[PDB]
From a paper:
The heterodinuclear Mn/Fe cofactor is found in the R2 subunits of subclass Ic ribonucleotide reductases (denoted as R2c) as well as a related group of proteins known as R2-like ligand-binding oxidases (R2lox). Although the physiological function of R2lox proteins is not known, the cofactor catalyzes formation of a tyrosine–valine ether cross-link in the protein scaffold. Two proteins from this group have been characterized to date, homologs from Mycobacterium tuberculosis and Geobacillus kaustophilus. Both contain the ether cross-link, and both co-purify from heterologous expression hosts with a long-chain fatty acid ligand bound in a hydrophobic channel leading from the protein surface to the active site, hence the name ligand-binding oxidase. The two metal ions are bound next to each other in octahedral geometry by two histidines and four glutamates, with the manganese ion occupying the N-terminal metal-binding site 1.
The cross-linking valine, which is completely conserved across the R2lox group, was changed to an alanine, isoleucine or leucine (V72A/I/L). Crystal structures were obtained of all three R2lox point mutants in the non-activated reduced and the oxidized resting state by soaking apo-protein crystals with MnII and FeII under anoxic or aerobic conditions, respectively. The V72A/L mutations were found to have little effect on the global structures of the reduced and oxidized resting states, but an ether cross-link was not formed in the oxidized state. The mutations affect the position of the fatty acid ligand in comparison to the wild-type, likely due to decreased or increased steric constraints in the respective active site. Since the outward shift of E202 in the oxidized state reduces the steric strain on the active site, the effect is much more pronounced in the reduced state structures, but is also observed in the oxidized state. In reduced V72A-R2lox, however, the fatty acid ligand is less disordered than in the wild-type and clearly bridges the metal ions as a monodentate rather than a bidentate ligand, with the second carboxyl oxygen pointing towards A72, whereas in V72L-R2lox, the fatty acid ligand is displaced upwards in the channel in the reduced state and does not coordinate the metal ions at all. Primary or secondary carbon atoms, however, cannot be oxidized by the Mn/Fe cofactor of R2lox, likely because the resulting alkyl radical would be too unstable.
Numbering used by the authors:
A (entry chain A): 3 to 286
B (entry chain B): 3 to 250, 263 to 286
Amino acid sequence: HHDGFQTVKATIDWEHPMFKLYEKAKRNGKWNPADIDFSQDQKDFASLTSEEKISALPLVAGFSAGEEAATLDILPMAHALARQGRLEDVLFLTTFMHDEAKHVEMFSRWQQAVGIGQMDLSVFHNDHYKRIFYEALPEAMNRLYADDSPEAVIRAATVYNMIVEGTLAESGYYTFRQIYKKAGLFPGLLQGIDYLNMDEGRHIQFGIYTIQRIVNEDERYYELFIRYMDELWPHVIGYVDYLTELGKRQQQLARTYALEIDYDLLRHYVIKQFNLRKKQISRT
Amino acid sequence: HHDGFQTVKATIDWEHPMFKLYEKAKRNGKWNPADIDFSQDQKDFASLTSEEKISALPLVAGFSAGEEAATLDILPMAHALARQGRLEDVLFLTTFMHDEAKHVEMFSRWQQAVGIGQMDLSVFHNDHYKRIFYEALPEAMNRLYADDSPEAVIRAATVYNMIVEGTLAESGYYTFRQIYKKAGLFPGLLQGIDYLNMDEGRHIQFGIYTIQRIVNEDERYYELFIRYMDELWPHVIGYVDYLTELGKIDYDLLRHYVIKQFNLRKKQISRT
Ligand SMILES: CCCCCCCCCCCCCCCC(=O)O
Ligand SMILES: CCCCCCCCCCCCCCCC(=O)O
Ligand SMILES: [Fe+2]
Ligand SMILES: [Fe+2]
Ligand SMILES: [Fe+2]
Ligand SMILES: [Fe+2]
Ligand SMILES: [Mn+2]
Ligand SMILES: [Mn+2]
């Protein structure tokens, strides 16, 4: 039952940080995946050798499943904050969810356009990937339906916003630019990634706001955050190692396009992102 | 756990009706309540007598609470269809939810601008209004977390889309235009109502799609739909009666518009 309604008893809290982020989301999140021209991506992909064609698919496989999970799995956080009466957070999260729908859509449109929609890309999800995206993420989010304690909310935000978005997704944007933008390939995909990277800046800010406000109540939760970050790292790097090992086995795309793909620089960027995210939460 | 992912094994079902509605929602649903200029609404409201001022508040109180409930209470429907693997429905519902967020925002910005944001408007929710929006609506939606049976989904869409949106909300837009558009009052609010009414056409389409696809499996669900509609009618008309009595502009014309919408919504679902 509803006890009453905030915008009947009072108004929206116009100065709330999540209302301000909601306003930025509406202003800055206008792109439509349906407007991206993928006709050159189709030609690029068809001109690749079958072995150059493979080079790109593990990353796309990781993002398609990642964004699809993100779309489904943010719903429990919106429910939990709604139940807590956090109306401005909920408003913001409608833009978060609609962003993720556009991200799932964008990657699926690319796969359709380049002619791999019919290919099952699950083969590029190794055990570490599955531990994060098939298991740990939905588990942490679904918990919130029955347990919205500070510990549960910190864990959900850590897995979703700080690891999946703030570490893996961020490193995936960078990787995509380091390879395909340098090669001059897949302009529509890169246009999509750029829009998506802009959206995700807000998503990470929501995760920081959420973790920090809970840490602010009791510094003890800061140790929980660091611990949960560290619990997931073995699967973060276990998946990065797998993609790295795949990239190192099929190198014709790098050879062909004179790319010196520095996977050790990429691996270093993942480590950088992970420690950067930790640093954006403070004990006090 | 996730078993797999549709956009990894295959793609979005591009021809799905809810994917098509999602595409339409992106193309058509671009407005921003923050762009509406409410400066003349403030002057219009200050120009009213105290008695005229209060006459305007019950309808706004009903909408502000209604849109806030809608924002919160669509989440279980999104969850239940997500759990059923109905990805295109879920994509569409992200536009549904962000629409309701704009609707809540719009009416709250209007209250702030005209100077009643500090006034507790709960006094204009009578028992019938509370039965629907404080109780029946969240009850039917939340049920879906533990019971996503056809009967539960039909009931949820009936209360939310066919009664709250298709009957009360539709009749409220009409009412605002019959009274204030004709009076030349609150142009910012009426601009908002117009955008909101465009959005809500899609929301009603989702409810029709959802109810009819379940009805298509079994005509016993058609009778359930009609029963749930009739079960809520006394509170619908109990609230309309309350608003009409406060108003005392053809109220019998408005009251008949409500009945018209109610019967219209029933006729948009077919037994067959
Ligand atoms: C060799 C370096 C590898 C770099 C890591 C590649 C990461 C692939 C990204 C897939 C998951 C991203 C999903 C984000 C969803 C969301 O917005 O929450
Ligand atoms: C005098 C005739 C009265 C006509 C009916 C007035 C009803 C007031 C509006 C309140 C309901 C708002 C519902 C929100 C709709 C949504 O789910 O998006
Ligand atoms: Fe995100
Ligand atoms: Fe391993
Ligand atoms: Fe609606
Ligand atoms: Fe009554
Ligand atoms: Mn995303
Ligand atoms: Mn609405």
